[PDB]
Amino acid sequence: QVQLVETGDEVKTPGASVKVSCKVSGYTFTSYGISWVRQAPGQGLEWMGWINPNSGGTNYAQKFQGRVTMTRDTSISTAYMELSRLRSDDTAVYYCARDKRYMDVWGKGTTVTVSSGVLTQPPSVSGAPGQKVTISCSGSSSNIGRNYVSWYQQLPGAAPKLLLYDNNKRPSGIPDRFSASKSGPSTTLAITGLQTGDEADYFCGVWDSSLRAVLFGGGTKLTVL
Amino acid sequence: SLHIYNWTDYIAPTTLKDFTKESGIDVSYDVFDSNETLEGKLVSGHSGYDIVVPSNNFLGKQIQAGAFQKLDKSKLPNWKNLDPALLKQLEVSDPGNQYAVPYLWGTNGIGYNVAKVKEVLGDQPIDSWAILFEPENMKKLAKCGVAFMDSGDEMLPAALNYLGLDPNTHDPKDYKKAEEVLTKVRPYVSYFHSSKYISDLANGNICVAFGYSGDVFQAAARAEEAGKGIDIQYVIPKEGANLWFDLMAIPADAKAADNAYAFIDYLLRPEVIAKVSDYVGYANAIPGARPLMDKSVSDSEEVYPPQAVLDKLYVSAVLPAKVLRLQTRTWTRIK
């Protein structure tokens, strides 16, 4: 079925260079884009770059152009990201996601550990079982204001999942309780029959048309009682 | 060879070079800025284009007059790359999709220099058609240049839908109202032109114009490329606006009829149309092309609007020819 499989897992020195392969399975590879989402331990999702597997197009987030390189062996349906000045920071899980504007199917993430030496979103909400709770995410005319939004739910220890796309659409599986709204430069997810299994980090993601990056929210952690 | 008649600023630069380069078929690209210009050439009759591109309402009246040979869909294999729900929406002008293949579609609205507007209009929000259709707003914006489209099919159904009347009304009483709205802000319109605002917005010659979806998005991206601090933006007013669809159609008196099919099968490719839309700033009818497009285009709510925005946009109807003359008279009276 539709999946991406990622690389082996890799310990690396502060001056170095790392390549993360990502193999796709069970879908016309050249039809959808591909996206790299980095996540340092304990922190949030970060847009790296997007590669058009059909034309080799490279949209690098401005933080990484000049240090990242994204490629693709169309013959062997895989994509490649290479960081190239590994720093005490870059210690992270490097996720790989099929990009159809949003990111519906995510890889399982590869960890790089390099050892030696945006969007106002609240940090956490706590709710009781049963009740309703909201999570906002405020951008600008450049981002939440102009372009469609995506919401991602990251359950514990898991890679991010797609919760909402096209401002407020639900993927098959995401239940009725999960729905999003939108006014001006804010998108507010709101979960209604707050169960226990909904304890997770939730991230909004939009495209800021002026910076040219998939801006993520800082993230909210949800703890249900 | 192949002869084509399409709108201005409505194709990527290397789309043709890529086509001839792949197929060998040399192309001749001719251009027009209004629907009427095209429609005029079509009754001229002997206009020797193999591929012309009208809007959705104009296409339907030209079908009812037999201008375009049927589509030999055997020579359009990529025809299934087309959005099925888009096609069915356009049976109202082409029943059973017999003559026209979609190309690009979009809306229309206000395009404005944010800095020079707020300079003359303050923090007033630019969200109502009353920006262009009210003298108390226009009298001041007039120092900064306003540009209407030279077409009663754009200016008049917009003024109708602004007051809340039917933009596809057949009633001469209604056009009366819309007429005396437009003719009360005409003293402040710097010109009527369906195209020379795109360049005129980016260079700061005007500061607001009735424009098309991508025309403004072009004008904006042209402006920042020049790098002088001109902020051009596009806002579908709160009263809604015109949704339309442009479609490619092969005339009957055409002769490169086969070459025309090849060029239209090469634009049904989800790869190429992406490069077209990415450049021109309009949404295309190939659903497979969005995952491949520049996000700022393929993700825009004004390029690809959502339903809530749609559910208040009028689609120009195939008006009875009695009424079209009421348009042309009324619009020429505004001259």
Q: What is the CATH number of the domain that holds B35?
A: 3.40.190.10
- CA B244 to CA B312: how far, in whole Å? 13
- CA A105 to CA A84: how far, in whole Å? 27
Closest Cα of chain A to B71: distance in Å?
A: 28
Give B 254-293 residues with CB within 8 A of chain A. 270-271, 288, 290-292
- CA A4 to CA B64: how far, in whole Å? 52
Strands B2-7, B189-192: pairing is: unpaired
Same domain, B94 and B116: no
Is residue A35 classed as helix, strand or coil in its secondary structure?
strand
- CA A165 to CA A168: how far, in whole Å? 6
Under 8 Å between Cβ of B313 and B328? no
- Up-side HSE of residue B30: CA atoms within 13 Å toward CB? 14
**Which residue intervals of chain A bear CATH 2.60.40.10?**
3-114, 124-224
The angle at the Cα of B278, spanning B272 to B284, to the nearest 5 degrees, equals: 65
Number of H helices, E strands in chain B: 16, 12
**How far is the CA of B27 from the CAs of B19, B50, B78, B266, in angstroms?**
8, 10, 21, 13
Closest Cα of chain B to A88: distance in Å?
A: 32
Q: Which residues of B118-144 are buried (b: 16+ CB within 10 A; e: fewer)?
A: eeebeeeebebbbbbbeeebbeebbeb
Same domain, B271 and B333: no
- CA A107 to CA A48: how far, in whole Å? 15
- CA B213 to CA B283: how far, in whole Å? 9
Same domain, B292 and B309: no
**Chain A contact set for B306 (CB, 8 A):** 148, 166-167
**Chain A contact set for B302 (CB, 8 A):** 146
- Structural domain count, chain B: 2
Question: Which CATH number among 3.30.70.260, 2.60.40.10, 2.70.150.10, 1.10.760.10 corresponds to the domain A124-224?
Answer: 2.60.40.10
Same domain, B206 and B231: yes
**Experimental resolution (Å):** 3.4
Structure determination method:
X-ray
Provide the token pair at A219.
């993230």
| Residue B296 contacts A, CB cutoff 8 Å | yes
Same domain, B180 and B90: no
For A144, list phi and psi in degrees, rounded to 5: -50, -25
| Structure-token match 């009424």, residue found | B323
CATH class of A3-114: mainly beta
- CA A216 to CA A150: how far, in whole Å? 9
Strands A18-25, A78-83: pairing is: antiparallel
Same domain, B295 and B318: no
**How far is the CA of B22 from the CAs of B25, B237, B263, B266, in angstroms?**
8, 43, 10, 10
- CA A225 to CA B141: how far, in whole Å? 58
Helix or strand run (H / E) with residue B211: strand B208-212
Identify the closest residue of chain A to B300 by CA–CA distance.
Answer: A147
Tell me how far the alpha carbon of residue B97 is from its chain's centroid. Answer: 20
Helix or strand run (H / E) with residue B202: helix B197-202
Which residue type occupies B65? A
Same domain, B139 and B197: yes
Same domain, B215 and B269: no
Tell me how far the alpha carbon of residue B272 is from its chain's centroid. Answer: 20
- CA A216 to CA A125: how far, in whole Å? 18
**How far is the CA of B169 from the CAs of B62, B128, B133, B178, B316, in angstroms?**
20, 21, 19, 11, 10
**Chain A contact set for B299 (CB, 8 A):** 101, 147-148, 206-207, 209
Domain region containing B55: 1-105+245-304
Identify the closest residue of chain A to B235 by CA–CA distance.
Answer: A146
Under 8 Å between Cβ of B12 and B279? yes
For B103, list phi and psi in degrees, rounded to 5: -125, -80
For B95, list phi and psi in degrees, rounded to 5: -65, 130
- CA A109 to CA A189: how far, in whole Å? 25
Under 8 Å between Cβ of B3 and B30? yes
Q: DSSP states of B83-146 as a string?
A: -HHHHHHTTTTSGGG-SEEEEEEE-EEEEEEHHHHHHHHTT--S-STHHHH-HHHHHHHGGG-E
Strands B146-148, A220-224: pairing is: unpaired
**Chain A contact set for B292 (CB, 8 A):** 31, 33, 52, 54-55
Closest Cα of chain A to B22: distance in Å?
A: 16
| Structure-token match 């600008």, residue found | A140
- CA A2 to CA B318: how far, in whole Å? 45
